[PDB]
Ligand binder design. Sequence first.
Ligand SMILES: CCCCCCCC/C=C/CCCCCCCC(=O)O[C@@H](COC(=O)CCCCCCCCCCCCCCC)COP(=O)([O-])OCC[N+](C)(C)C
Ligand SMILES: CCCCCCCC/C=C/CCCCCCCC(=O)O[C@@H](COC(=O)CCCCCCCCCCCCCCC)COP(=O)([O-])OCC[N+](C)(C)C
Ligand SMILES: CCCCCCCC/C=C/CCCCCCCC(=O)O[C@@H](COC(=O)CCCCCCCCCCCCCCC)COP(=O)([O-])OCC[N+](C)(C)C
Ligand SMILES: CCCCCCCC/C=C/CCCCCCCC(=O)O[C@@H](COC(=O)CCCCCCCCCCCCCCC)COP(=O)([O-])OCC[N+](C)(C)C
Ligand SMILES: CCCCCCCC/C=C/CCCCCCCC(=O)O[C@@H](COC(=O)CCCCCCCCCCCCCCC)COP(=O)([O-])OCC[N+](C)(C)C
Ligand SMILES: CCCCCCCC/C=C\CCCCCCCC(=O)O[C@@H](COC(=O)CCCCCCCCCCCCCCC)COP(=O)([O-])OCC[N+](C)(C)C
Ligand SMILES: CCCCCCCC/C=C\CCCCCCCC(=O)O[C@@H](COC(=O)CCCCCCCCCCCCCCC)COP(=O)([O-])OCC[N+](C)(C)C
Ligand SMILES: CCCCCCCC/C=C\CCCCCCCC(=O)O[C@@H](COC(=O)CCCCCCCCCCCCCCC)COP(=O)([O-])OCC[N+](C)(C)C
Ligand SMILES: CCCCCCCC/C=C\CCCCCCCC(=O)O[C@@H](COC(=O)CCCCCCCCCCCCCCC)COP(=O)([O-])OCC[N+](C)(C)C
Ligand SMILES: CCCCCCCC/C=C\CCCCCCCC(=O)O[C@@H](COC(=O)CCCCCCCCCCCCCCC)COP(=O)([O-])OCC[N+](C)(C)C
Ligand SMILES: N#Cc1ccc(COC[C@H]2O[C@@H](n3c(NCc4ccc(Cl)c(Cl)c4)nc4c(N)ncnc43)[C@H](O)[C@@H]2O)cc1
Ligand SMILES: N#Cc1ccc(COC[C@H]2O[C@@H](n3c(NCc4ccc(Cl)c(Cl)c4)nc4c(N)ncnc43)[C@H](O)[C@@H]2O)cc1
Ligand SMILES: C[C@@H]1CC[C@@]2(OC1)O[C@H]1C[C@H]3[C@@H]4CC=C5C[C@@H](OCCC(CO)CO)CC[C@]5(C)[C@H]4CC[C@]3(C)[C@H]1[C@@H]2C
Lengths: 1105, 123, 168
Amino acid sequence: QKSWIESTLTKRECVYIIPSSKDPHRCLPGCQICQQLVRCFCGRLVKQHACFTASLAMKYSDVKLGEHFNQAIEEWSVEKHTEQSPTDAYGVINFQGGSHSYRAKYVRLSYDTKPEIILQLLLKEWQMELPKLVISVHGGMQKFELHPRIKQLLGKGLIKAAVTTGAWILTGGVNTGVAKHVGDALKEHASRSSRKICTIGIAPWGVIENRNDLVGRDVVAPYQTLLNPLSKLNVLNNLHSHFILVDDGTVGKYGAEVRLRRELEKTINQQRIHARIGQGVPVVALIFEGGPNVILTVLEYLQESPPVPVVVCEGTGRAADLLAYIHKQTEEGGNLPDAAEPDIISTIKKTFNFGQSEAVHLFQTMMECMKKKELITVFHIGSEDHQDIDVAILTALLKGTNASAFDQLILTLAWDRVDIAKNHVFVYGQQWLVGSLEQAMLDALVMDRVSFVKLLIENGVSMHKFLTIPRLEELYNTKQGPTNPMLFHLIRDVKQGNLPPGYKITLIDIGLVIEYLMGGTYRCTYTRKRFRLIYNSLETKRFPYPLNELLIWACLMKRQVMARFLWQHGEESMAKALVACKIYRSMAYEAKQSDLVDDTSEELKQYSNDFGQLAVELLEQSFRQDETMAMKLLTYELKNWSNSTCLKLAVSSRLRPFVAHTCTQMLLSDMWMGRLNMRKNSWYKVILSILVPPAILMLEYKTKAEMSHIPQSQDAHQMTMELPITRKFYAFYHAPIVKFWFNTLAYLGFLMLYTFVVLVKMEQLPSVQEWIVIAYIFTYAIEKVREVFMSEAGKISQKIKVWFSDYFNVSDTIAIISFFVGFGLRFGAKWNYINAYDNHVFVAGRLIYCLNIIFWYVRLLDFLAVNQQAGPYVMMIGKMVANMFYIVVIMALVLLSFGVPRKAILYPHEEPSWSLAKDIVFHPYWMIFGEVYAYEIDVCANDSTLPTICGPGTWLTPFLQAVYLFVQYIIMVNLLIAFFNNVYLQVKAISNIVWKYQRYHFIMAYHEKPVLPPPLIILSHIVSLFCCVCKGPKLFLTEEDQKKLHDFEEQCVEMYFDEKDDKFNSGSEERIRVTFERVEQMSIQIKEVGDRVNYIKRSLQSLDS
Amino acid sequence: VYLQVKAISNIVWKYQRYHFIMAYHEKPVLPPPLIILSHIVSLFCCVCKGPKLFLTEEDQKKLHDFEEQCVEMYFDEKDDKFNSGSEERIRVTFERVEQMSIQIKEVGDRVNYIKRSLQSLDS
Amino acid sequence: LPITRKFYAFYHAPIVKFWFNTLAYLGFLMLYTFVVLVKMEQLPSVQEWIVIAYIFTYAIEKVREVFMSEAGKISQKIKVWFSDYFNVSDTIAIISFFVGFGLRFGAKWNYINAYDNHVFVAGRLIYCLNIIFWYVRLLDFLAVNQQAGPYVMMIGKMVANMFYIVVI
Ligand SMILES: CCCCCCCC/C=C/CCCCCCCC(=O)O[C@@H](COC(=O)CCCCCCCCCCCCCCC)COP(=O)([O-])OCC[N+](C)(C)C
Ligand SMILES: CCCCCCCC/C=C/CCCCCCCC(=O)O[C@@H](COC(=O)CCCCCCCCCCCCCCC)COP(=O)([O-])OCC[N+](C)(C)C
Ligand SMILES: CCCCCCCC/C=C/CCCCCCCC(=O)O[C@@H](COC(=O)CCCCCCCCCCCCCCC)COP(=O)([O-])OCC[N+](C)(C)C
Ligand SMILES: CCCCCCCC/C=C/CCCCCCCC(=O)O[C@@H](COC(=O)CCCCCCCCCCCCCCC)COP(=O)([O-])OCC[N+](C)(C)C
Ligand SMILES: CCCCCCCC/C=C/CCCCCCCC(=O)O[C@@H](COC(=O)CCCCCCCCCCCCCCC)COP(=O)([O-])OCC[N+](C)(C)C
Ligand SMILES: CCCCCCCC/C=C\CCCCCCCC(=O)O[C@@H](COC(=O)CCCCCCCCCCCCCCC)COP(=O)([O-])OCC[N+](C)(C)C
Ligand SMILES: CCCCCCCC/C=C\CCCCCCCC(=O)O[C@@H](COC(=O)CCCCCCCCCCCCCCC)COP(=O)([O-])OCC[N+](C)(C)C
Ligand SMILES: CCCCCCCC/C=C\CCCCCCCC(=O)O[C@@H](COC(=O)CCCCCCCCCCCCCCC)COP(=O)([O-])OCC[N+](C)(C)C
Ligand SMILES: CCCCCCCC/C=C\CCCCCCCC(=O)O[C@@H](COC(=O)CCCCCCCCCCCCCCC)COP(=O)([O-])OCC[N+](C)(C)C
Ligand SMILES: CCCCCCCC/C=C\CCCCCCCC(=O)O[C@@H](COC(=O)CCCCCCCCCCCCCCC)COP(=O)([O-])OCC[N+](C)(C)C
Ligand SMILES: N#Cc1ccc(COC[C@H]2O[C@@H](n3c(NCc4ccc(Cl)c(Cl)c4)nc4c(N)ncnc43)[C@H](O)[C@@H]2O)cc1
Ligand SMILES: N#Cc1ccc(COC[C@H]2O[C@@H](n3c(NCc4ccc(Cl)c(Cl)c4)nc4c(N)ncnc43)[C@H](O)[C@@H]2O)cc1
Ligand SMILES: C[C@@H]1CC[C@@]2(OC1)O[C@H]1C[C@H]3[C@@H]4CC=C5C[C@@H](OCCC(CO)CO)CC[C@]5(C)[C@H]4CC[C@]3(C)[C@H]1[C@@H]2C
């Protein structure tokens, strides 16, 4: 059948017939009038059945021969005289009119359906999600009216209570009862609002208009709101999203809905509210009017097991006005005050007139309701009852139903409502147990509800006690919440490619992920001996810093709102923000590169850049407070983050705004000096003190106190304890500023020689000038092999892959290799002794030198770039060569568009020759640079320098060249002037940032360099290899300075969050709106007090007469 | 004039990129020395005997649902932006200080008619 | 995905048709540049026949583009095809080439010295100018890139706007 509905759900049709009561309507021909009018006691008359079996009985006179023994007339039994079949009416209502064409779903099932099959319909078949609340609205059965005051408020909270909790509203569906005003509340307060409420309406099929219109299989129904005055039935309301229409077999009568509805309430309250929680989906009953069937229903619920509470609304109709009335005059449980029988029966006799016996009967039904006063809520809309029915509907389930504070909290957790938990579960004087709070935390973390994690920490949860191994090991192994498919992939990589099927994640495996994601020499606390030991054992399992471990969890699970929350709790705030930037950045890179599912890398990089911006904004806060302590914050060993450093973590993530912040640049400037005080010295004296060593003793240095924020070597720090003479020489030659100039003077004296060598004749054997040059380039290359081995990271292929990621290290490799190719050819050649340059091998070697020299001038940009101003312009050149590339590809096309016709028109009689490759490209390029070749244009002219080139067609070339230069200069050169001038500012801004970033790697490279330059560096090597075989900088803090520094960081995260709010709360946009939202409330309170004075005037006339 | 010519020119390039790419679904496989094969094969298969987005029935359904949901979000977010702006909150603030100011002097007039009752019920 | 479906999937991709046409077009200009720079005897060299084959078969491709354009109204198929710069220049570049091949090929060769025939000269010089259309057409292929394309499109918009400074 290709439909679960057709196979399972069943209709009902009165196959048998039973005529109406007795009476022929009028009109003597008794036989005719019988078949014409007479209803079946089914509910439909004889000609509506059609009931093919009964049809061959319709002809006789009907089914069932005549008088039929009046016992057997009433023997109508829906179980006996009515038949099932694969249903006809299930599809989609397409409400025509209204607006937007609101679209609902329906079905025509039998009341013989089992209760579970309806839950199988809503969820599996109609594709609905199981809710966290059900609101069963009973009330008016006949169309009524509400004060537009009382209308809109119930439409504020019945919505808001159903949006947040993903609730189902079970109505009657028919547009005559509560469903009208429930349905209207959907209208005014934007039921869509990007979050539709799954409003269901259960009605019986026998009483609804347009039954035929809803017939068909998966058919879109042209159903309309045509309230014909001649109609007798009800119209399906528009704004209800779903409908269940019981097929009682009869037509016309009500009744065959109340079973299914109550059984659906059971069938939902017998479902787990959420896989993590062990309650059932609660149910609440809401009331807007009522007759006897309603207040009887109210009694049922209070009697039920489990008891379903009730919310009555004073000011809405017959019952609800009464149920608040009788309830207000009542006491603790079960009473009327001594003289109230006369008054209350009169209200019954007036409010719903049955009269003095059915009043007293239903009055006794009202007694047993008021007995269970504890479950019923009487939210009265008059002034301020139960704080805005939202609270009342939701808090009503948190009343005398014996549910302990745990069960009270966990339900507000599933709903994701803290305002309830704050104001109604953490009420003054609550009876909390030992593990209830901790257990609710484990549920909030896994379900990713930060606002309860906040609430529980505030209300007494210590995350040191709640962070054991199995818990935090469980937290990674959860599908009960927002999970990361990226994590299980990262685990497969570190595990050599294997993944056993069950595989509960462990913490030693998370450690291998973080070590992989942070890279280099990072070593997590999960892979150490202390942890691996106690791990196999499981006070001693409590993680002294848990919020360092849940910040990683939140980030490996891609739970940002949890991450930013768990970040601002604890200490080491910048460090946690800079690790987090590196985790996501690596996850983004792996997620991008790894081809597993849809990318998710745009999400992770933004998460990285969010934490990377926090760290910068903190560093600015620290820096504006105390510049000296802020520089210490950059360089202290962390001891919880693998003995790393906040700079080292920012550099690790290529986080340029932190490295280009004016604190790092202020520190890097102070490491550049060393012990020297270059505030009260000058570069004249540093250079002179290099060439005149004894002048090292007459320039000023820094004390141990100015050097307290500056990281140092072990030896450098020991020599601050003592300033003697031999300490002032160590302090000088080991400064990065001194190593620099001491290398520039050697490098400038290098080029002066190597320029001299290349311009002067070169005999068979190298001159003294040339041996000094080979010594430099040789010893300089040993220096570079030393740089690679002592780089940072023990993984060799990374030492190499990072060293060739630098322009001037790649060119040195080319410049050094090329030079010894040149020296080999120069030196190892059979000299001729008649004329050099009869040896093509000596030529090659010399010409390699004459080109190798170019690498060594361009390298002066590495030394010029140490300056503030020069450096950025150096860095621009690369960024600008990259961006002009395509204007220059067009300029090269225009070149060959011209050079090939020019050469072909002027030189026809050419054989194939490699000169053709030159001549199509040579002169047209030199035209770009001012050379017009004025006397080679018009080769047939008298002033021509190419009169032999005159021939047929050569008059075309001046036209071609006129076009050529127009295109080059007047378009393509000025487009390029236009390019640069309109891209200068942002390339100059990036280039200041990139220069300030490379200034880290530059300066920190010079702590590592030896003292002596690259002719004399070999001494420093031989001394180092002699002291390596026979036998970086840290910020040393004493114990009282690590103390005062952590106090400094905490104080600056306070000022940060404070000033961030004070800026926001003091802004224009935020004061306009709080002004706006109070003129809301006041304007209501003036008309309220404007209404009261109207009720003060009435008293004046009252007390007057 | 560089910036606005460069901005138009990104737009015009992105427009011509339609005609360019959609021209290549139509092109044969072989380039214009060997394209003649693809022609002879096409004239041989034309005498002897563009791209559509095929959706099944359940994807035309889920797609029309997607469009309707996005016109909702469009009109909603267009109003929420407007109703939440400064100019619109200043004026609804303005138009209520109109009404309240009238209702204070109104209630400021009533209390003048409450004082008269005090002297009245006094004597 | 079977084997013969992976070949269909490849050669019928627009990215593949492109590069498969650029390599043929780049190898076209390399020949047609060689033909124009080297002496041209009475009969075309192998390099030049391959060039005529391209420009011929390439023109049949363009007649196919016009007929299979979109809209059955013929004068619209034509009016829309000549609304494109590089289709107009191909019409000039293709027509000019066969004027040139006709004069080059159908001339009474002299056998004492070429260029005593003013008709052979004209045909050759048409090739030496027709070559310009076929370089500029590399901007139609360079313009496939993000960055290059817009700068290509600027040149026209900027030649139009500088017109009156250049009249002065
Ligand atoms: C961190 C990375 C960056 C640093 C990179 C460092 C590595 C740089 C790598 C450098 C090596 C590059 C190649 C060297 C030259 C060989 C090739 C050549 O042209 O040979 C010639 C010389 O043949 C000889 O026999 C004479 C060689 C003399 C020694 C000079 C090279 C050794 C120094 C290397 C010091 C390097 C180590 C530096 C310190 C580590 C052969 O030709 P010929 O015999 O002259 O003439 C033959 C024909 N004829 C006889 C007819 C005329
Ligand atoms: C017909 C002639 C045509 C061409 C002619 C010349 C032009 C040829 C130009 C070639 C450069 C190609 C590199 C492109 C730029 C890439 C980006 C970059 O910053 O690169 C590098 C810097 O930039 C340079 O290294 C630029 C070097 C050329 C600038 C001019 C040199 C002046 C000295 C010579 C004077 C000699 C004069 C006399 C000589 C005899 C470094 O960056 P990176 O580490 O690679 O990082 C990539 C950036 N990213 C991370 C943001 C992605
Ligand atoms: C769409 C945009 C429009 C463009 C604008 C219009 C384009 C300009 C149009 C210019 C008109 C053309 C001028 C040539 C006229 C014929 C020459 C001739 O018959 O004899 C000459 C041949 O000389 C040549 O054949 C050289 C051809 C002229 C080159 C002009 C280049 C453009 C430079 C300017 C471009 C900027 C223009 C500025 C505009 C104000 C010489 O005479 P002869 O008797 O053969 O020989 C005598 C012997 N003798 C040589 C030994 C002495
Ligand atoms: C979608 C739109 C874009 C595409 C457009 C496509 C259409 C392009 C249109 C192209 C046609 C252009 C004109 C062709 C040449 C004729 C003019 C000429 O110079 O004749 C000469 C050659 O006269 C001959 O008799 C030899 C001709 C040889 C055949 C070459 C042309 C035919 C190929 C065409 C293939 C085109 C079709 C391509 C495929 C469809 C006459 O001079 P001569 O005899 O050499 O010398 C006389 C004097 N003398 C003897 C004293 C020296
Ligand atoms: C003395 C010399 C004077 C002049 C000299 C040269 C300059 C002569 C320039 C003439 C161009 C005239 C066109 C004006 C622009 C119109 C707008 C436009 O976009 O047009 C077209 C693109 O743009 C082009 O086609 C521009 C072509 C010239 C640019 C340079 C060519 C470089 C290659 C040659 C190198 C060869 C070098 C060697 C050769 C031997 C296309 O647009 P459209 O489809 O028409 O749509 C109209 C736009 N609208 C819809 C917005 C209205
Ligand atoms: C690697 C780094 C080393 C460190 C650098 C310091 C140590 C290096 C210092 C010196 C080493 C050189 C020894 C000098 C030998 C004297 C003979 C001589 O050269 O006579 C020449 C005169 O010219 C000179 O005397 C000057 C030669 C050097 C010029 C460059 C020096 C500047 C750099 C250093 C100082 C400034 C430092 C600037 C920066 C602050 C005559 O020419 P010839 O070639 O002898 O004659 C044969 C000619 N023939 C071949 C054509 C037949
Ligand atoms: C990776 C580095 C290694 C590079 C490869 C190894 C390079 C070493 C290669 C060769 C070493 C052996 C040299 C002799 C070659 C045989 C020919 C011969 O002997 O004599 C001939 C030389 O003919 C030449 O071509 C000489 C120049 C060739 C050197 C090319 C170096 C470029 C390498 C790239 C640059 C490095 C850049 C590297 C940057 C990364 C003739 O000279 P003759 O003997 O005097 O006889 C006179 C002839 N006569 C009778 C006609 C008058
Ligand atoms: C269109 C704009 C207005 C112009 C309209 C008017 C012009 C119309 C167009 C072209 C005019 C062509 C004739 C002029 C030459 C006469 C003199 C002559 O003989 O010159 C030379 C030959 O010249 C030729 O043989 C010409 C080649 C054919 C023209 C090719 C198209 C060029 C223009 C592109 C197409 C046009 C569209 C371009 C769009 C801008 C000299 O050769 P010779 O005689 O052998 O000399 C003896 C040599 N000896 C002593 C060394 C042995
Ligand atoms: C239309 C598209 C086709 C597709 C392209 C591929 C197929 C086309 C491939 C080949 C077809 C050509 C056959 C070669 C014949 C050999 C003889 C020869 O030419 O000898 C010459 C040497 O020069 C050469 O051998 C090279 C000649 C071609 C240069 C351009 C090839 C690059 C393009 C294609 C390849 C790279 C592709 C790049 C793109 C990725 C000697 O000169 P000559 O003229 O023989 O001697 C007479 C001289 N005379 C007249 C002065 C008296
Ligand atoms: C739409 C396309 C069709 C174009 C029109 C049809 C073109 C075909 C036209 C003509 C075909 C017939 C050629 C012969 C002409 C008569 C003269 C003659 O025979 O000999 C003379 C040639 O004199 C010349 O002028 C030769 C060059 C003319 C060709 C012009 C082509 C430009 C067309 C525009 C370019 C196309 C651009 C199209 C782009 C849209 C002399 O040469 P000879 O015979 O060797 O005698 C030696 C003389 N002597 C004794 C002095 C030494
Ligand atoms: N204090 C200080 C200080 C001293 C020197 C420097 C120079 O920095 C050198 C490094 O600067 C790097 N670099 C450079 N180098 C600039 C440059 C290098 C070579 C040449 Cl020929 C030129 Cl025309 C310009 N440009 C970069 C870029 N656009 N993006 C990222 N990195 C770039 C490059 O790896 C090179 O090794 C920077 C700061
Ligand atoms: N992917 C991709 C892609 C590939 C190629 C292209 C190139 O587009 C070609 C078309 O671009 C058209 N075109 C162009 N072409 C640019 C151009 C054409 C020729 C030359 Cl010589 C130059 Cl100096 C520049 N400019 C236009 C403009 N200013 N306004 C409207 N249309 C313009 C023109 O009709 C031409 O046919 C565009 C996108
Ligand atoms: C898309 C672009 C179009 C333009 C262009 O790039 C690509 O197309 C390329 C094709 C090249 C030619 C191919 C083959 C040869 C043969 C050789 O024959 C040696 C003979 C003898 C020496 O005497 C041996 O001993 C001489 C050189 C020549 C003609 C090339 C010249 C440059 C050309 C024209 C290039 C040009 C820059």
